[PDB]
Amino acid sequence: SPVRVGLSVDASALGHTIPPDYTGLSYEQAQMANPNYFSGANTQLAGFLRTLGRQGVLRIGGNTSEYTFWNRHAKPTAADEHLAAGPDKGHHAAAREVITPEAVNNLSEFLDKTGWKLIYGLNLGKGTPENAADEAAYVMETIGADRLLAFQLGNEPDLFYRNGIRPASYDFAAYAGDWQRFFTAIRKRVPNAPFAGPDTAYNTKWLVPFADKFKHDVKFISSHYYAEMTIERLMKPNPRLLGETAGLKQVEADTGLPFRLTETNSCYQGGKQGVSDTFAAALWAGDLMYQQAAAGSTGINFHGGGYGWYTPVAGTPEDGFIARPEYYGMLLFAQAGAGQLLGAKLTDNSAAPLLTAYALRGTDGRTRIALFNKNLDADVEVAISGVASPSGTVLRLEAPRADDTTDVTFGGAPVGASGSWSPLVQEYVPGHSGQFVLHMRKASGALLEFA
Numbered sequence: 001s002p003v004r005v006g007l008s009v010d011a012s013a014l015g016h017t018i019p020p021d022y023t024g025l026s027y028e029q030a031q032m033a034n035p036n037y038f039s040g041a042n043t044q045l046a047g048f049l050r051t052l053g054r055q056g057v058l059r060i061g062g063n064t065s066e067y068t069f070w071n072r073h074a075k076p077t078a079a080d081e082h083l084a085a086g087p088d089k090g091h092h093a094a095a096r097e098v099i100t101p102e103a104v105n106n107l108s109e110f111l112d113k114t115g116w117k118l119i120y121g122l123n124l125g126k127g128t129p130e131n132a133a134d135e136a137a138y139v140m141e142t143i144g145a146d147r148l149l150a151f152q153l154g155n156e157p158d159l160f161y162r163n164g165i166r167p168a169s170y171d172f173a174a175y176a177g178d179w180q181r182f183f184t185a186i187r188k189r190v191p192n193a194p195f196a197g198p199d200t201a202y203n204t205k206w207l208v209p210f211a212d213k214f215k216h217d218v219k220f221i222s223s224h225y226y227a228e229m230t231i232e233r234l235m236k237p238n239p240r241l242l243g244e245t246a247g248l249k250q251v252e253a254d255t256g257l258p259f260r261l262t263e264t265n266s267c268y269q270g271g272k273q274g275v276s277d278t279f280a281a282a283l284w285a286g287d288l289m290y291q292q293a294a295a296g297s298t299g300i301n302f303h304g305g306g307y308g309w310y311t312p313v314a315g316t317p318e319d320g321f322i323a324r325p326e327y328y329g330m331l332l333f334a335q336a337g338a339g340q341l342l343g344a345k346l347t348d349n350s351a352a353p354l355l356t357a358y359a360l361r362g363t364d365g366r367t368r369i370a371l372f373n374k375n376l377d378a379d380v381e382v383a384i385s386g387v388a389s390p391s392g393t394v395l396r397l398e399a400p401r402a403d404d405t406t407d408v409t410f411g412g413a414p415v416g417a418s419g420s421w422s423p424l425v426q427e428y429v430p431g432h433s434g435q436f437v438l439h440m441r442k443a444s445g446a447l448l449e450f451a
């Protein structure tokens with residue numbers, strides 16, 4: 001007994017344009033202590049990034065960016081030649097790590113194998129303005145202007161008052177004083193240096209005051225989002241999401257600087273075993289990419305590394321890399337590709353309320369629809385109107401249970417080594433122009449492409 005829902009596509013209801021560099025990943029700065037990780041020799045990880053997008057952004061930052069120190073004469077230690085730095089769990093201070101010129105040289109070679117651009121964290125929490133300027137000069141020289149999208153001056157500065165990085169009295173005004181001092185030092189050595197911020201954890205009250213004070217000094221505004229957890233809770237809206245969406249919309253409405261979600265994943269403190277590492281996270285992540293794009297976001301960076309519960313890609317240079325379940329929701333987005341969002345209204349859906357749908361006119365002119373049946377107990381039958389085409393094909397995003405940590409496929413295939421992926425099962429959509437009908441099992445996703 002599927003829940004019978006209507007989906008009306010309205011090509012006259014033009015939404016936001018999704019740019020080619022929308023997709024992205026975030027890693028801990030501590031990983032730059034291992035020059036083998038972001039390296040030309042890491043062909044496996046480079047292939048996972050290429051499969052997520054021809055263009056995209058690598059963001060390096062996180063809690064460890066306050067505990068990582070640039071040393072222009074240093075070489076890496078024994079332990080850090082083998083370091084796989086997973087997401088910081090945010091319980092206490094991270095271990096001190098050193099970043100070497102060799103690590104920045106190898107990062108350039110890595111980025112050049114991918115086509116991706118870089119957002120690079122500087123140490124405003126514990127470092128000096130002069131050391132930041134020295135690091136920025138080396139990064140700008142080596143990575144180059146076309147691949148360096150932005151420096152960010154600290155990670156989650158809105159938590160320095162609580163985590164001991166600053167006094168209890170630290171507030172936006174104190175942060176703006178620190179930010180101006182680092183900005184001035186860096187621009188003295190790197191007059192072309194680009195910036196973004198404030199890279200906040202959650203405090204939306206900082207976004208527009210940052211944008212207004214530093215309007216002539218930044219390329220875009222950035223903030224973070226974590227949904228925390230149970231799988232049922234992850235499939236629903238929550239107040240924190242509503243607040244972050246409202247913050248993004250205030251930036252777009254009050255400034256005309258673009259916004260990027262520079263660090264996001266399902267559950268903070270490194271994720272939750274049984275939620276973040278499950279097929280549910282693929283549906284959560286693919287739905288999030290579209291919801292934020294529909295709300296006016298220019299891009300996203302899913303946090304990860306090591307074998308963290310929420311990482312899209314898990315592994316090490318020594319042991320190899322694998323796509324975790326969340327990767328498959330980002331792979332649906334990659335396959336849908338860039339374009340402009342169209343209206344897509346669901347009706348008769350109160351029985352299947354966690355079903356989401358997004359329509360897109362691709363750069364090639366063809367209509368695509370991304371659906372996420374996030375209902376854990378309801379199959380749906382989707383009557384699709386407003387789409388004119390002889391023919392459509394469906395790629396399904398599936399696992400046998402929402403809590404599965406494996407068995408995830410897209411287009412009837414898993415991702416293989418080095419991000420290898422091609423569709424092996426493609427089905428025609430039942431119906432004809434102006435009336436297509438699509439069945440979806442409970443807890444599943446679909447990408448429809450029309451001729």
Ligand SMILES: O=C(O)[C@H]1CNCC(O)(O)[C@@H]1O
Binds near residue numbers: 224269270
């Ligand atoms: O708590 C987490 O999972 C995140 C929160 N944001 C900072 C971080 O990326 O360093 C951390 O790993």
